[PDB]
Amino acid sequence: MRVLLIEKNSVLGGEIEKGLNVKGFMADVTESLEDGEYLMDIRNYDLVMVSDKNALSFVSRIKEKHSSIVVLVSSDNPTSEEEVHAFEQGADDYIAKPYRSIKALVARIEARLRFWGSNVIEIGDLTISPDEEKIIYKGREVEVKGKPFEVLTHLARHRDQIVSKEQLLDAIWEEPEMVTPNVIEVAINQIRQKMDKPLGISTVETVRRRGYRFCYPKPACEE
């Protein structure tokens, strides 16, 4: 996890840099959104913090381009106008720039995410965390954010149950996504040729009785 501090004043970024260090978090200082937009492109950050007034525009694109991320905007003018705009535009939390006491700022970031990590589904050595939008295989952590991984998260949860072709559709989409008609055909034959490879364990059965039946692998129950 990394923290992004978009501030032109290196002095204020200096104190915060040694402020979150106590939590063992990494801090990054940038100038205008341009440096933050170009710097974040090569590296992703868990906490997106920016004290720039044009933050409303930046957080707006960060919320839609990456809603699965935290945003902490600041402002030396905590007025009711910026308060509603911060939550309406798309801000996870807003702190008065003047900083109540540094530890007050980081403290809010700490309670926001201390352990940072969770998982809902767990089968064998494979662990899928749909709440945190994160898939793990063989102990390998991989991020997800697209239609190709969307289905991967679908069977990840509704596993161990019957799955018809219409099931993936209504569980994913087709018309609204302007996808190519009959997407279940190429999407399932490939996802399987791409899933059994990395996992190495089969967990899908094809039958004409209904469609595709997903069954948990050999007893993954602890001995």
Q: Contacts with a copy of itself: how many residues (CB under 8 A)?
A: 17
87 binds a copy of itself (CB under 8 A): yes
> Minimum distance from CB of 188 to a copy of itself (Å)?
21
211 binds a copy of itself (CB under 8 A): no
Question: Which one-letter DSSP state was computed for residue 78?
Answer: -
Amino acid residing at 192: R
111 binds a copy of itself (CB under 8 A): yes
Name every residue whose Cβ is closer than 8 Å to that of residue 123 and which is 6 or more positions away in sequence: 159, 203, 216, 217, 220
210 binds a copy of itself (CB under 8 A): no
Task: Tell me how far apart the alpha carbons of residues 34 and 32 are, in angstroms, rounded to a whole number.
Answer: 5
Task: Tell me how far apart the alpha carbons of residues 168 and 36 are, in angstroms, rounded to a whole number.
Answer: 38
Q: Which stretch binds a copy of itself (CB under 8 A): 3-11, 12-20, 84-92, 196-204?
A: 84-92
Residues 144, 162, 183: CA angle, nearest 5 degrees: 55
Strands of 78-143 (E only): list them. Answer: 93-96, 121-123, 126-129, 134-137, 140-143
- Size (the chain), residues: 223
> Minimum distance from CB of 39 to a copy of itself (Å)?
28
One of 24, 42, 64, 80 touching a copy of itself (CB under 8 A): 80
Taking residue 115's Cβ as centre, other Cβ atoms within 10 Å add up to: 5
Task: Tell me how far apart the alpha carbons of residues 12 and 178 are, in angstroms, rounded to a whole number.
Answer: 47
> Minimum distance from CB of 203 to a copy of itself (Å)?
16
104 binds a copy of itself (CB under 8 A): yes
Binding mask 148-187 for a copy of itself (x = CB under 8 A): ------------xx--------------------------
> Minimum distance from CB of 42 to a copy of itself (Å)?
31
12 binds a copy of itself (CB under 8 A): no
One of 11, 24, 64, 79 touching a copy of itself (CB under 8 A): 79
Which CB, 161 or 189, lies closer to a copy of itself? Answer: 161
